[PDB]
């Protein structure tokens, strides 16, 4: 079966150009034979993105004829090109801003009205997708996090349950990993998705709720690892006087 392999740097600085490429596997762009099924002329090599908290957005497409169609919301920031001899096609999105942070997928679109034998399922749709490239618009360099405690206090524990956590601040790029008590503490843990702050650095918090009395008998340590910077932190979170 046909697959799309995605590549290109997802990390783009504000105002600069995003450049992504996909390579087609299991088919070739330069084969103009049509012996069975649908013609390769009926494939439209396409780009779709999903920004955080938004739905799917169609960016545009190209055929091996060289003809493009582009979303009017973009269209002079966007260029799509195809290199038939290399089985590749590319997306260039210029003048990026934080609104362009998103997962970018390439996909095969199909539009046939003629075929030989059986028409494979998936016509008039985007039937084959790449796995996506997460694109981050940021001026940042690699940076490890600071890890700060989210400490319980007398006022916050007085209903019998205590919340406690770690704020994992100002790191780049993704990802971090967070465990509690070296992975022994999993119940009631919530590690929130990171947010890309206006500074261009990420932040997240990880929290856990426990019985308030266990603050007197159990130590709580968050274990934070940021592989890109070779940073490992263990932070003990203590009740705050």
């Amino acid at each position: 079966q046909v697959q799309l392999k995605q590549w290109g740097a997802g990390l783009v600085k504000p105002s600069e150009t995003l450049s992504l490429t996909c390579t087609v596997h299991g088919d070739t762009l330069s084969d103009y034979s049509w012996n069975w099924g649908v013609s390769r002329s009926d494939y439209y090599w396409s780009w779709i993105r999903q920004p955080p908290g938004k739905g799917l957005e169609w960016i545009g497409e190209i055929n091996r004829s060289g003809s493009t169609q582009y979303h009017p919301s973009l269209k002079s920031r966007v260029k799509i090109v195809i290199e038939v001899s290399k089985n590749q096609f590319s997306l260039e999105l210029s003048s990026v801003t934080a609104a362009d942070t998103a997962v970018y997928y390439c996909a095969r679109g199909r539009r046939s009205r003629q075929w030989i034998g059986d028409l494979p399922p998936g016509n008039h749709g985007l039937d084959v997708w790449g796995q996506g490239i997460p694109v981050s618009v940021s001026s940042a360099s690699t940076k490890g996090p600071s890890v700060f405690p989210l400490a319980p206090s007398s006022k916050s524990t007085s209903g019998g349950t205590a919340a406690l956590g770690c704020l994992v601040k100002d790191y780049f790029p993704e990802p971090v990993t967070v465990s509690w008590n070296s992975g022994a503490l999993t119940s009631g843990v919530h590690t929130f998705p990171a947010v890309l702050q206006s500074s261009g650095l990420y932040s997240l918090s990880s929290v856990v709720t426990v019985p308030s009395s266990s603050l007197g008998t159990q130590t709580y340590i968050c274990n934070v690892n940021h592989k890109p910077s070779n940073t490992k932190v263990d932070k003990r979170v203590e009740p705050k006087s």
Binding site: I48, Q50, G55, L56, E57, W58, G60, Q69, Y70, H71, P72, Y105, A107, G109, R111, P120, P121, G122, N123, H124, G125, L126, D127, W129, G130, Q131, G132, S146, F148, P149, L150, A151, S153, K155, S156, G159, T161, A163, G165, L167, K169, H190, F192, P193, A194, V195, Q197, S203, L204, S205, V207, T209
Partner: protein
């Protein structure tokens, strides 16, 4: 305009495994059923084509998925939900009018009883204050449904534009959501004020719940 727009309903459909799900899509202009497609999207995975070209199932799509509709009004039906079907679904006009826009998505989540959040507020740590910035964190823990409103007040003054929210996926054991709201101030602004409060509105709360602290007390 020179484009077709698709509006899906409801925004969130809350159901139990085994129930029938009916998802709606309204296009702003008539679209032949040859050109109306449906997709599934499960967090962390690429979108998957479900249905296209006059309601035909794509490869690998099981029989419980079906579609119908004409003119401007289209429906995706899941006859009996399986646990793997709790996901986000998108319609799309594909093949008659560029751009080929998607609807905004309908999330199908797992129905459960209304649960109010437990709310916790955290001051900036003394460690962080040694730098130039203060983060104040409000945690809404284990609530349902997802809709919730968090407002920050500093010395009783409503805050705007200086907070960000993050929300977990629905919990696999109790089907709740959790949310963090983080208020970012300069250290200098933080040290100028006394009362820090987050105020939470949710269907499970008779009236809004406020958690607060006084800086340095």
């Amino acid at each position: 305009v020179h484009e077709i727009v698709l509006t899906q309903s409801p925004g969130t459909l809350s159901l139990s495994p085994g129930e029938r799900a009916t998802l709606s899509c309204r296009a702003s202009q008539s679209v032949s059923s040859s050109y109306l497609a449906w997709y599934q999207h499960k967090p962390g995975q690429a979108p998957r084509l479900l249905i296209s070209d006059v309601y035909r199932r794509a490869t690998g799509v099981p029989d419980r998925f079906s579609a119908s509709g004409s003119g401007t009004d289209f429906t995706l039906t899941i006859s009996r939900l399986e646990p793997e079907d709790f996901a986000v679904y998108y319609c799309q006009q594909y093949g008659i009018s560029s751009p080929f826009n998607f609807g905004q998505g309908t999330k199908v989540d797992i129905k459960r009883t209304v649960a109010a959040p437990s709310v916790f507020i955290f001051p900036p740590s003394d460690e962080q204050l040694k730098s130039g910035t203060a983060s104040v964190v409000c945690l809404l823990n284990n609530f349902y449904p997802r809709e919730a409103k968090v407002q920050w007040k500093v010395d009783n003054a409503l805050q705007s534009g200086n907070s960000q929210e993050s929300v977990t996926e629905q919990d696999s054991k109790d089907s709740t959501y959790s949310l963090s709201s983080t208020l970012t101030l300069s250290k200098a602004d933080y040290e100028k004020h006394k009362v820090y409060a987050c105020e939470v509105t949710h269907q499970g709360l008779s009236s809004p719940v406020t958690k607060s602290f006084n800086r340095g007390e």
